[PDB]
Amino acid sequence: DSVFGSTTEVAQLKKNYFLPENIISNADVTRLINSDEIQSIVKAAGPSRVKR
Amino acid sequence: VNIIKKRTKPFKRHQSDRFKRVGESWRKPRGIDSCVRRRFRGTISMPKIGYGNNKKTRYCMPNGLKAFLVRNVSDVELLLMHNKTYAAEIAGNVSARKRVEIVEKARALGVKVTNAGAKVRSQE
Amino acid sequence: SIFAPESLLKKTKAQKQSREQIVAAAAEKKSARQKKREL
Amino acid sequence: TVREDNGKLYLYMKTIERAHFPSKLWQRIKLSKNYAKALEQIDQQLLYWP
Amino acid sequence: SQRSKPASENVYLKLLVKLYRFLARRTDSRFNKAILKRLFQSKTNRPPISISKIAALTSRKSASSQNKTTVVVGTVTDDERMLTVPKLSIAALRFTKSARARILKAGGEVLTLDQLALRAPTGSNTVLVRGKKHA
Amino acid sequence: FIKKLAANDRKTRDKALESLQRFLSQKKKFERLDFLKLWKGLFYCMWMADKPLYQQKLSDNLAALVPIVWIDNRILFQSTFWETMGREWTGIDILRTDKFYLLMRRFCAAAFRDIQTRSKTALLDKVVAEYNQMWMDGPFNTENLAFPNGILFHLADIWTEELRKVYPEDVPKADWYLPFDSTIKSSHNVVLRKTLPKRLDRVSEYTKD
Amino acid sequence: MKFSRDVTSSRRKQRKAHFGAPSSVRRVLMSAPLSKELREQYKIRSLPVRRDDQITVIRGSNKGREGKITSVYRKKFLLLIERVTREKANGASAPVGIDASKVVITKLHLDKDRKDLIVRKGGKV
RNA sequence: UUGAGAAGCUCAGACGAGUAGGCAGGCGUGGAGGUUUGUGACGAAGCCUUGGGCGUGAGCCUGGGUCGAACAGCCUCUAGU
RNA sequence: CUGCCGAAGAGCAGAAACUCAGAUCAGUUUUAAAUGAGAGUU
RNA sequence: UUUCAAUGGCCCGUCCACGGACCAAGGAGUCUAGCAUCUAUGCGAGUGUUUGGGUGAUGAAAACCCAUCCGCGAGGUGGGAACGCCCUGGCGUGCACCAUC
RNA sequence: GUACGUGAAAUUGCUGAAAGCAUUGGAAAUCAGUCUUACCUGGGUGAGAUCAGUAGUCUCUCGAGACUAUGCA
């Protein structure tokens, strides 16, 4: 924790260094897609692989 | 599905027969006056994408299976769930000690081996 | 005594809700098509 | 997963809550030689799974 | 950098693209189609936006509910030429370290585009701003 | 207790739960940040729960821990749970949401059961109003947009089911649905407002205060 | 792993140094283990071979053979042992040489210098 | 219904000459890092072969003969390719 | 190696960006609208 | 595979001419400095450790760290993406960008 | 076998057979791989184990594996 610091607090053994910030917050995207937040407003899905 | 091949002949290089210095691997004819590149009559064919085989039966040996090169016993155990879909092939550099162990294991697994009679003898 | 997962209970409510309307637009669609065929 | 060991088949299960303990990551159960019971065992141990 | 996918090799931007591919096609929202399109854009096509711009753009008529989250598919940089930062709520690809500290300490909160999606999956009450492409 | 509740050994975690009953049963005022720290330990006690049989006995144990708490800070205990669950809900992964869904279901019923218990000592409407006020500056707060809507859809789904379970025979007249009505009437997130009525199973039979 | 930049790990230099080693250096390169008893009574693991040492061949086609080292052929790093020879086509017994590491010394030819070497190299005569 | 290498799977329709020139994806060689619980004196590599197989192709796999000490797949790096 | 696009003999060919059936066009024809095509731009 | 049959089949490259007896091996857009665009990456009103100093007990030409400099940088109208509220459309907000005062 | 590791092609001799670029097939020569032993069902005889209205040990976390006895319903 002194070598690398935090994303908000600095490293002690590196000058002015903060751990990189991430583009996403929760990297589990299947958790985002299949959540009650998003699955409650999506339009009802058509078939998977469809018949001919 | 049956294993349909659109073509069975190799696409020999132009004038590979005329010269021993000219190999038989295909090279597109870069020439600008080349009659054969011009696809005259009787000129030998050139690799086109239309000869490409069916995506469902690509890579399939005449018996409907696909070759899966195998170097030891651990490899033949991967084909446990694909024995109707794949055939084991022992590499040429696998010794006759391992070849026997590969073949015996694969026999219980119900896996076809394309070269199971190699480097070995029978005693019965 | 393993209770069914909560997310599974939520999906069933949506699947049931979707199945209600698909069944609802079955007898009407059959009738409307049938009358369309006579027309 | 199902894998063989000494002529006996086992069901191996891992959950996310033991992800950081490789030694205790997989639990193992012994499946019956009875095929129907072994199928019942997989249903019973893997219920509400996908 | 193109129309079909991003040219970035960053996995987390691909994960964002994987999420907004879903919204783009399983919702009627035009907000989720725009976000997916702007996620395929290059660095120069996603010019940075500033804190001062965001406060200035969302002002004057700020007597409204102002629950509107500001969304940029880009970086929210800092503008130290302004002294007091209002209460803002911004969802961006990136915040610089001083931009994120100012929005938090004097004001509201900073989001990611996946945190927005769980808040406004249809982009409702959002101000989808853009940076100037003047180079 | 806090470090022990999040141990890597279930035996160590469990021994901190049994010792937590004495700590919570104290007749002294607990500061809000003290319950914030405790619930971070308790969150990881359930975050690390392994089997569904265990992780559902644990939810019963944690919900059964509410009546142990002192009456004066019993509301603080539950309000801190719903605040420690709102901020940490987004970071939960897809394979852990179903054990916390049951945890909120067990804590929703604990709230209704605590109202039932206190309805004997004092009039019901004061108890409900005090609990409703807890919901107002908690999950059903309109001023904050950080609270997840996945929890609020859960509470709407289970609100009447847990109410019926607490009073099998018949529930009295009270403002059971006040947090939801005031939310849909003033929520700043349209997705919540537009779909909360579609999920809530509000019955008009018992809602007239 | 070597840590000294005085010693080389270059194969080209090690091979050149081995084969272009002088006869004094080759004297140490041809060293044989002592038998268990000599190893456990002289407290020395291994000594350079000498003429008139009683050895046993340990490896090769002549395994198990014994004899005295008639001479040391230091140019080819080979030992020559009594009666360990090969018959030629004409009937001559041309000796065959063995590597000094492939034999074991079972009786040392103890000069005064060896005894001084023994005591110097942690030994007890 | 199990058919998420979501970079996957699936439905449909149209289209197909090509020099300069542009774009994309692949095959191969020497060396580098990682990897295959990799191959090897029960024979590595190479070479020979009217033996067999795969790929539209660049090419790859293999049987037999010869041989006798090293070699390769996969992910990146590099170039006197 | 295969594929795709593809001339000329400022114009002709693409790429990004925008603005788009609620748009303009056309190696066309009638009259003094018909028909085909989504059209453009820096 | 060889051969036969029927059918087709005019030597290749190069620019008539020029190269070609055959085979193997070697054999030609390379490295480096400058500039411009495009893409990716990190940070972002900043940015760039590697002139040098610190340091490195397993190889120490690496990796790690960094003082002082220094470079380069430093208001309305209409249309309009997106959004909210309504009873296709209307109303409000209106990024980027383009004509406008 | 020192004209010595491997030993390619061009090239030369001898022997054997045939004859006097592509398409498609014939003749001749050659070659690839090709299955039978299993499935179900019934009974008899014994076997054991994941069985015992059964006793113990070790490692993990009540029961989960590994065992050692004892029985063969």
UniProtKB/Swiss-Prot annotation, chain B:
Q: Which GO terms describe its cellular component?
A: cytosol; cytosolic large ribosomal subunit; nucleus; preribosome
Does the keyword Nucleus feature in the UniProt annotation? yes
Q: Which GO terms describe its molecular function?
A: structural constituent of ribosome
Keywords of the record: Cytoplasm, Nucleus, Phosphoprotein, Ribonucleoprotein, Ribosomal protein
What GO biological process term is on the record, naming one? cytoplasmic translation
Q: Which residue positions does Phosphoserine occur at?
A: S74
Main subcellular location: cytoplasm
Miscellaneous comment text of the record: There are 2 genes for eL32 in S.pombe.
Which family is annotated? Belongs to the eukaryotic ribosomal protein eL32 family.
Q: What PANTHER family does the record point to?
A: 60S RIBOSOMAL PROTEIN L32 AND DNA-DIRECTED RNA POLYMERASE II, SUBUNIT N, RIBOSOMAL PROTEIN L32
**Assembly mode:** Component of the large ribosomal subunit (LSU). Mature yeast ribosomes consist of a small (40S) and a large (60S) subunit. The 40S small subunit contains 1 molecule of ribosomal RNA (18S rRNA) and at least 33 different proteins. The large 60S subunit contains 3 rRNA molecules (25S, 5.8S and 5S rRNA) and at least 46 different proteins.
Q: What is this protein called?
A: Large ribosomal subunit protein eL32A
The organism of origin for this protein: Schizosaccharomyces pombe (strain 972 / ATCC 24843) (Fission yeast)
Source organism lineage? Eukaryota, Fungi, Dikarya, Ascomycota, Taphrinomycotina
UniProtKB/Swiss-Prot annotation, chain C:
Compartment list: Cytoplasm; Nucleus, Nucleolus
Residue ranges crossing the lipid bilayer per the database entry: none
Domain of life of the organism in this record?
Eukaryota
A further note on this protein reads: There are 3 genes for uL30 in S.pombe.
Family statement: Belongs to the universal ribosomal protein uL30 family.
User: How the protein assembles, per its UniProt entry?
Assistant: Component of the large ribosomal subunit (LSU). Mature yeast ribosomes consist of a small (40S) and a large (60S) subunit. The 40S small subunit contains 1 molecule of ribosomal RNA (18S rRNA) and at least 33 different proteins. The large 60S subunit contains 3 rRNA molecules (25S, 5.8S and 5S rRNA) and at least 46 different proteins.
What does the function comment of this entry state?
A: Component of the ribosome, a large ribonucleoprotein complex responsible for the synthesis of proteins in the cell. The small ribosomal subunit (SSU) binds messenger RNAs (mRNAs) and translates the encoded message by selecting cognate aminoacyl-transfer RNA (tRNA) molecules. The large subunit (LSU) contains the ribosomal catalytic site termed the peptidyl transferase center (PTC), which catalyzes the formation of peptide bonds, thereby polymerizing the amino acids delivered by tRNAs into a polypeptide chain.
Query: Can you name this protein?
Result: Large ribosomal subunit protein uL30B
From Swiss-Prot, chain D:
Q: Where in the cell is it found?
A: Cytoplasm; Nucleus
Instruction: Spell out the family assignment given in the record's similarity comment.
Output: Belongs to the MAK16 family.
What this protein is called in its record is Protein mak16
Query: Which part of the complete sequence is present?
Result: 52 to 101 of 302
UniProtKB/Swiss-Prot annotation, chain G:
Q: Where is this region: Disordered?
A: 1-23
Q: Transport among the record's keywords?
A: no
* Chain segments annotated as transmembrane: none
InterPro entries named among the record's database cross-references:
KOW (IPR005824), Rib_uL2_dom2 (IPR014722), Ribosomal_uL24_CS (IPR005825), Ribosomal_uL24_euk/arc (IPR005756), Ribosomal_uL24_KOW (IPR041988), Translation_prot_SH3-like_sf (IPR008991)
Listed GO MF terms? RNA binding; structural constituent of ribosome
Tell me a GO cellular component.
Answer: nucleus
Pfam families from the entry?
KOW, Ribosomal_L26
Q: Which domain of life is it from?
A: Eukaryota
Record's NCBIfam families? rplX_A_E
> Assembly and interactions?
Component of the large ribosomal subunit (LSU). Mature yeast ribosomes consist of a small (40S) and a large (60S) subunit. The 40S small subunit contains 1 molecule of ribosomal RNA (18S rRNA) and at least 33 different proteins. The large 60S subunit contains 3 rRNA molecules (25S, 5.8S and 5S rRNA) and at least 46 different proteins.
**This protein's name:** Large ribosomal subunit protein uL24
Taxonomic source organism: Schizosaccharomyces pombe (strain 972 / ATCC 24843)
